[PDB]
Design an enzyme around this catalytic site. Structure first.
Site, PDB file in Angstrom:
ATOM      1  N   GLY A  70       0.767  -1.237   0.000  1.00  0.00           N
ATOM      2  CA  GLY A  70       0.000   0.000   0.000  1.00  0.00           C
ATOM      3  C   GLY A  70       0.801   1.292   0.000  1.00  0.00           C
ATOM      4  N   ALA A  83       2.691   6.622   4.822  1.00  0.00           N
ATOM      5  CA  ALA A  83       3.658   7.626   5.322  1.00  0.00           C
ATOM      6  C   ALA A  83       4.508   8.240   4.195  1.00  0.00           C
ATOM      7  CB  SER A 121       4.420   2.823  -2.709  1.00  0.00           C
ATOM      8  OG  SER A 121       3.309   3.544  -3.143  1.00  0.00           O
ATOM      9  CE  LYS A 151       8.213   5.458   4.419  1.00  0.00           C
ATOM     10  NZ  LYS A 151       7.267   5.314   5.605  1.00  0.00           N
ATOM     11  CG  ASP A 209       8.017   7.697  10.022  1.00  0.00           C
ATOM     12  OD1 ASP A 209       8.465   7.941   8.876  1.00  0.00           O
ATOM     13  OD2 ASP A 209       7.550   6.553  10.319  1.00  0.00           O
TER      14      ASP A 209
END
Ligand SMILES: CCCCCCCCO[C@@H]1O[C@H](CO)[C@@H](O)[C@H](O)[C@H]1O
Length: 337
Positions: free
Chosen positions: A27, A30, A33, A49, A164
């Protein structure tokens, strides 16, 4: 320099070291992707990420750097940490992408409270872990500013990390002074959030489910009572003041009557977190020593952080400056044990 391979995952080309395998998108989270990947180096599954347009602008670039600085700095069992950072670029001239690698997480606090009904032992351990990480964060001179269920990771072993950003309206957990745009606010704004989270864990219900920032203030005053003389004196905003003074006083409810059935020591701690006056709000460190946590507290296992240099927050720099600084930070990264 590791050997990289390329792969189209839904949207974009991912370029990662061969050490990370079977990438599997999980998905958008933050800002960028996320794929789950198998780390062949350790035999553990991780989250990789890829940052979304890290250098799109001054705003994006400075936040890419902020986020690299913070994640590199956090080294604590109850705070998200950095297993690896990399870029396929080989030189500052090519430098466009930033990939961040952390433990694969799976669920947030919100996922947990929503199915089950938390026992007192669980609230003790979850809250304890929040406060422990928050002591560490606070001791770096960082204020989190957005503690809420979706920013707290919780595994199947009910172990917790402060995030975060998300793997739940911010307003529901926000200290009243932020809601009044009061400048200079201290660390205790996070302690207020922790109180709202704790209350929700005990009752199953959002403490103050406000519909906007004004409604939010109404709901907050219903519980804690209109501010005393000593606190109104401090307001300054005349509209905030008229708003607070308008409506029929509804002063301090009995926390005990609101949390009827919760452990009395949890009710007492709540009363000390959820004080209007941030000067008088219990600290992360003090809260850790509250008898509510007697089962968990260990003063020799509640560590603090190396001081964090956040002066860069006070600069307006060019995108290529922010980007060069981030570049130095990718390059100087030292992986954990
Ligand atoms: C719910 C509506 C009333 C909210 C009153 C908020 C009281 C906030 O507390 C205030 O925070 C300020 C900023 O950190 C400090 O300068 C003040 O000393 C402190 O008393």
């Amino acid at each position: 320099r590791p050997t990289f391979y390329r792969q189209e995952l839904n949207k974009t080309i991912w370029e990662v070291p061969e050490r990370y395998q079977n990438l599997s998108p999980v998905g958008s989270g933050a800002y960028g992707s996320v794929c789950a990947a198998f780390d062949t180096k350790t035999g553990l599954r991780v989250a990789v990420k890829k940052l979304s347009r890290p250098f799109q602008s001054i705003i994006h670039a400075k936040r890419t750097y902020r986020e690299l600085r913070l994640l590199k700095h956090m080294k604590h069992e109850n705070v998200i940490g950095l297993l690896d950072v990399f870029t396929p670029a080989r030189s500052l001239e090519e430098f466009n992408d930033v990939y961040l690698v952390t433990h694969l997480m799976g669920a947030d606090l919100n996922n947990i409270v929503k199915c089950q009904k938390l026992t007192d032992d669980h609230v003790q351990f979850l809250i304890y872990q929040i406060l422990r990480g928050l002591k560490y964060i606070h001791s770096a001179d960082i204020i989190h500013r957005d503690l809420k269920p979706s920013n707290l990771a919780v595994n199947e072993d009910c172990e917790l990390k402060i995030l975060d950003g998300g793997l739940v309206a911010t307003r529901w957990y926000r200290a009243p002074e932020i809601m009044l745009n009061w400048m200079h606010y201290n660390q205790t704004v996070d302690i207020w959030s922790v109180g709202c989270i704790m209350a929700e864990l005990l009752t199953g219900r959002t403490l103050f489910p406000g519909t906007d920032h004004i409604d939010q203030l109404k709901l907050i005053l219903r519980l804690v009572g209109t501010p005393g003389a000593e606190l109104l004196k401090k307001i300054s905003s005349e509209s905030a003041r008229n708003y607070i003074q308008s409506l029929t006083q509804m002063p301090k409810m009995n926390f005990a009557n609101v949390f009827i059935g919760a452990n009395p020591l949890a009710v007492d701690l709540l009363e000390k977190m959820l004080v209007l006056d941030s000067d008088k709000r219990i600290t992360a460190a003090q809260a850790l020593a509250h008898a509510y946590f007697a089962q968990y507290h260990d003063p020799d296992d509640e560590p603090v952080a190396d001081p964090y240099d956040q002066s860069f927050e006070s600069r307006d720099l060019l995108i290529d400056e922010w980007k060069s600084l981030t570049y130095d930070e990718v390059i100087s990264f030292v992986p954990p044990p």
